[PDB]
């Protein structure tokens, strides 16, 4: 279709610049680089969210230990906030899975 658009632009009388197989090789290079970079970055984001959830469980254990230890009246609100944090984090992980499943065509077109 790049060839076809170039041919139609030449037919219409406008200026045209020739398309070579070097352009296709550069396109494949861009595809590979963009796919690898974006997939690695987003997979690192997902793994970091999982590690953060593990650290949230560890800090829930830590604040339970602090509960075991007039400055001890924050844990109820803390757990109430962290439950919603966990719910929004698992929803974000589901949307992460969806964008992992759709990232290929986005990378190709870009």
From Swiss-Prot:
It is found in: Cytoplasm, Cytoskeleton. The modification N6-acetyllysine is found at residue 80. It is linked to Charcot-Marie-Tooth disease, axonal, type 2O: An axonal form of Charcot-Marie-Tooth disease, a disorder of the peripheral nervous system, characterized by progressive weakness and atrophy, initially of the peroneal muscles and later of the distal muscles of the arms. Charcot-Marie-Tooth disease is classified in two main groups on the basis of electrophysiologic properties and histopathology: primary peripheral demyelinating neuropathies (designated CMT1 when they are dominantly inherited) and primary peripheral axonal neuropathies (CMT2). Cortical dysplasia, complex, with other brain malformations 13: An autosomal dominant disorder characterized by global developmental delay with impaired intellectual development. Some patients show signs of peripheral neuropathy, such as abnormal gait and hyporeflexia. CDCBM13 is associated with variable neuronal migration defects resulting in cortical malformations. Cytoplasmic dynein 1 acts as a motor for the intracellular retrograde motility of vesicles and organelles along microtubules. Dynein has ATPase activity; the force-producing power stroke is thought to occur on release of ADP. Plays a role in mitotic spindle assembly and metaphase plate congression. Dynein heavy chains probably consist of an N-terminal stem (which binds cargo and interacts with other dynein components), and the head or motor domain. The motor contains six tandemly-linked AAA domains in the head, which form a ring. A stalk-like structure (formed by two of the coiled coil domains) protrudes between AAA 4 and AAA 5 and terminates in a microtubule-binding site. A seventh domain may also contribute to this ring; it is not clear whether the N-terminus or the C-terminus forms this extra domain. Homodimer. The cytoplasmic dynein 1 complex consists of two catalytic heavy chains (HCs) and a number of non-catalytic subunits presented by intermediate chains (ICs), light intermediate chains (LICs) and light chains (LCs); the composition seems to vary in respect to the IC, LIC and LC composition. The heavy chain homodimer serves as a scaffold for the probable homodimeric assembly of the respective non-catalytic subunits. The ICs and LICs bind directly to the HC dimer and dynein LCs assemble on the IC dimer. Interacts with DYNC1LI1; DYNC1LI1 and DYNC1LI2 bind mutually exclusive to DYNC1H1. Belongs to the dynein heavy chain family. This is Cytoplasmic dynein 1 heavy chain 1. It comes from Homo sapiens. The lineage of its organism: Eukaryota, Metazoa, Chordata, Craniata, Vertebrata. The gene is DYNC1H1.
């Amino acid at each position: 279709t790049l060839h076809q658009a170039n041919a139609r632009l030449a037919k219409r009388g406008g200026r045209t610049m020739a398309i070579t197989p070097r352009h296709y090789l550069d396109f494949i290079n861009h595809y590979a680089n963009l796919f690898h970079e974006k997939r690695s970055e987003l997979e690192e984001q997902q793994m970091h969210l999982n590690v953060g959830l593990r650290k949230i469980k560890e800090t829930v254990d830590q604040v339970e230990e602090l509960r075991r230890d007039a400055k001890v009246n924050r844990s109820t609100a803390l757990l109430k906030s962290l439950s919603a944090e966990r719910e929004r984090w698992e929803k974000t992980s589901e949307t992460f899975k969806n964008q992992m499943s759709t990232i290929a065509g986005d990378c190709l077109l870009s």
